């Protein structure tokens, strides 16, 4: 204080909704519903949302609004022994920027690709095609669809790479798209939230315009009801299995943003007596509701593919990049006015990703802006240096073998790491700092204590929720592979480095902080577990 504040509350809400709603709302939630008993999946999903996701989501938002600092300073002021959590969270967000932007660039690349009266990925008689190409998805690996070969052999040129050891030529048309993304991010974030919170009005709202248009074209298609059937038809037999609850737990956790320091930074610009609890609920709800909607958008079209284009539903119903960059564009191309559906689809994909990259970077800038007045004074300079380091290292993912690089980070950069970070975040808040202090902090802000429900969830449910995900994510571990390629053991260990490079800050910094403090070790856990709020009276 003085600390800059949101130019208006809608800016905050859209920044948060924009961060939380991204591509996985489209390319994973509907797939999980289809795979796990249809609308029955909503039960495990809703329970995980209620006892795990939203409480963690609420917590970080309240915590950021109360302590009014970014992730490093905040965790340091709250429990100095764990200042490292702020460092861990910061460079997890740092790694994620190295690859996640590439998805946006692919979106722009397909967008620039659809300025035409006849979409390229339609047919199997192009220079990049293979003797084995089919018009649509099949179930035999050696025979790709026309859209799959376009993505793979034309956009990516992934066929020309023999692995992560063979990144090949830089692909400048991609680097151009990667640069445009970073320019859009720079001129969105250099001036701070005064413009960043205005930009999100587009990037957070645009997808809903397109979701509506596609939802109508989708549901008017022949076979669209058949798709909705595959999407939502209940089968509670799935609920019996542990793997389904783990799928719900993990989806809930990664879909909401909790513990990345992003919600922390955004809430840190809230007015102190803002009703952060009302904001956390409205915001959670919109995230999940968007996934629900998008599922109709996807499977109406997926149903139209099965009914009309003559393809097994199981072959087109898929997750991840393949759904949005291959299967959906395939369906679009068969439709009248296809060029229009393609241009707004790929635009939606990019705006879906942009709000999210915004939040990741802001978690970083705000964290560093608060630790270091040097960079806070020079924001417009600092981000330019940061996005420059992004663009340069990111050129690796614009190479012909670039997917192999993307896929490596996508697995190791944030996955296992953030779960342990958030696990200590929960443990720090509820048990070191105390739910008592926290509840009291929340009342001083919003006028009432959190219910015993939110308290039980933070203290008990949350940590074993995160524990539940982390353990099944270990027991299910296998060495990294993509399609027929298997990554070399050194590549595997290198990702373990990226994974532990951040997690290690937690015990590292705890060890280093102990060795600058005067007293005996009973005396020293106390000096490092006493909150900054209390030392200053």
């Amino acid at each position, epitope marked *: 204080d003085e600390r800059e504040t949101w130019s208006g509350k809608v800016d905050f809400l859209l920044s948060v909704i924009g961060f939380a709603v991204d591509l996985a709302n489209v390319w994973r939630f509907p797939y999980l519903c289809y795979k796990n008993g249809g609308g029955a999946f909503l039960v495990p999903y809703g329970i995980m949302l209620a006892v795990g996701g939203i409480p963690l989501f609420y917590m970080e938002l309240a915590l950021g609004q109360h302590n009014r600092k970014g992730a490093i300073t905040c965790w340091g002021r709250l429990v100095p022994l764990f200042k490292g959590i702020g460092y861990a969270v910061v460079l997890i967000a740092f790694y994620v920027d190295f690859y996640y932007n590439v998805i946006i660039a692919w979106s722009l690349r397909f967008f620039f690709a659809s300025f035409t009266n006849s979409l390229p990925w339609t047919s199997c008689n192009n220079i990049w095609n293979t003797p084995n190409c089919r018009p649509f998805e099949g179930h035999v690996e050696g025979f790709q669809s026309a859209a799959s070969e376009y993505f793979n052999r034309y956009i990516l040129e992934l066929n020309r790479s023999e692995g992560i050891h063979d990144l090949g030529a830089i692909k400048w048309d991609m680097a151009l798209c990667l640069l445009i993304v970073y320019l859009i991010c720079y001129f969105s974030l250099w001036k701070g939230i005064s413009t960043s919170g205005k930009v999100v009005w587009f990037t957070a709202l645009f997808p809903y315009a397109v979701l509506l248009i596609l939802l109508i074209r989708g549901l008017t298609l022949p076979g669209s009801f058949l798709g909705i059937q595959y999407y939502l038809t209940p089968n509670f037999s799935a609920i019996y299995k542990a793997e389904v609850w783990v799928d719900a737990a993990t989806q809930v956790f990664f879909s909401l943003g909790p513990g990345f320091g992003v919600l922390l930074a955004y809430a840190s610009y809230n007015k102190y007596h803002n009703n952060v609890y009302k904001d956390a609920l409205l915001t959670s709800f919109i995230n999940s509701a968007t996934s629900f909607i998008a599922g109709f958008v996807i499977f109406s079209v997926l149903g139209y593919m099965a009914h009309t284009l003559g393809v097994r539903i199981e072959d087109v119903a898929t997750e991840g990049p393949g759904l949005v960059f291959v299967v959906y564009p395939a369906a679009i191309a068969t439709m009248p006015a296809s060029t229009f559906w393609a241009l707004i689809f790929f635009m939606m994909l990019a705006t879906l990703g942009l709000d999210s990259s915004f939040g990741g970077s802001e978690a970083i800038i705000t964290a560093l802006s608060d630790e270091f007045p040097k960079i806070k004074r020079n924001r417009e300079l600092f981000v330019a240096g940061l996005f420059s380091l992004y663009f340069v290292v990111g050129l690796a993912s614009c190479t012909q073998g670039g997917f192999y690089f993307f896929h490596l980070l996508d697995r190791y950069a944030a996955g296992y790491s953030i779960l342990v970070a958030v696990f200590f975040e929960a443990i720090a808040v509820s048990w070191i700092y105390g739910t*008592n202090r926290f509840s009291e902090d929340i*009342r*001083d802000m919003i*006028g*009432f*204590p959190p219910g015993r429900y939110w308290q039980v969830c933070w203290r008990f449910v949350a940590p074993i929720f995160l524990l539940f995900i982390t353990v099944y994510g270990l027991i299910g571990y296998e060495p990294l592979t993509y399609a027929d390629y298997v990554y070399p053991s050194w590549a595997n260990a290198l990702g373990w480095c990226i994974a532990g490079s951040s997690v290690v800050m937690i015990p590292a910094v705890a060890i280093f902080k102990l060795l600058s403090t005067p007293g005996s070790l009973r005396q020293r856990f106390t000096i490092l577990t006493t909150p900054w709020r209390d030392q200053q009276l």
Partner: antibody
């Protein structure tokens, strides 16, 4: 059930000082913020100070700030108002009042204890 | 400091009659932050209506409360002699917390 009992009031010369106390019982005293509210002989109600459930957030009316000090003993369940350089304007019945939720008000009150400041 | 002025100051009413009394703040008060207390002669105040409309525990249905912004009111639909007391309104929308100036309710006979 819930019961609050103020004590310690009495005659005091101006500039003098005195310590009121409120004995909470019948509920979990640690969980609730507490306030002192006074009522002058002219029957006006005037809020004095509020202390957090954990005692970490303290607010004072401008009338008593820098003279009064609100305190909290969560182990023994006793609220405290420590007065000093008292003046005749401080003459009132002092109430101790539960008030953890702002949206819900002061849900329970003591019977009050009377301060009289005179020469 | 958000002054709350109440009128009337004193009020006489026959049992069975409707009674209304008003609270005017010098600044806007969120309706979830406006409350009323009744204080019978010689006794401590009791919480009575909280956040504008909500009857407190044990408060008979005769009572009701309404308002927003800078204007609020207590209404007793059919007065009873046990209802004679002084009513105080209050805000928590901001520190310093402030109480209304009182409406003393009295029995006509």
């Amino acid at each position: 059930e819930v019961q609050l009992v103020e004590s310690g009031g009495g005659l005091v010369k101006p500039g003098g000082s005195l310590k009121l106390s409120c004995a909470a019982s019948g509920f979990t005293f640690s969980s609730y913020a507490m306030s002192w509210v006074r009522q002058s002989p002219e029957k006006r109600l005037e809020w004095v100070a509020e202390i957090s459930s954990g005692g970490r957030y303290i607010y004072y009316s401008d009338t008593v700030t820098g003279r009064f000090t609100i305190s909290r003993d969560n182990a023994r369940n006793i609220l405290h108002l420590e007065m000093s350089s008292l003046r005749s304007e401080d003459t009132a019945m002092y109430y101790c009042a539960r008030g953890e939720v702002r949206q819900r008000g002061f849900d329970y009150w003591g019977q009050g204890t009377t301060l009289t400041v005179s020469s | 400091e958000n002054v709350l002025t109440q009128s009337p100051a004193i009020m006489s009413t026959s049992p069975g009659e409707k009674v209304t009394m008003t609270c005017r703040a010098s600044s806007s008060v969120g309706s979830s932050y406006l409350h009323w207390y009744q204080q019978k002669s010689g006794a401590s105040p009791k919480l009575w209506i909280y956040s504008t409309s909500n009857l407190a525990s044990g408060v008979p249905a005769r009572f009701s409360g309404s308002g927003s912004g800078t204007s609020y009111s207590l209404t007793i639909s059919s007065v009873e002699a046990e209802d004679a007391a002084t009513y105080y309104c209050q805000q928590f929308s901001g520190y310093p917390l402030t109480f209304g100036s009182g409406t003393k309710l009295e029995m006509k006979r």
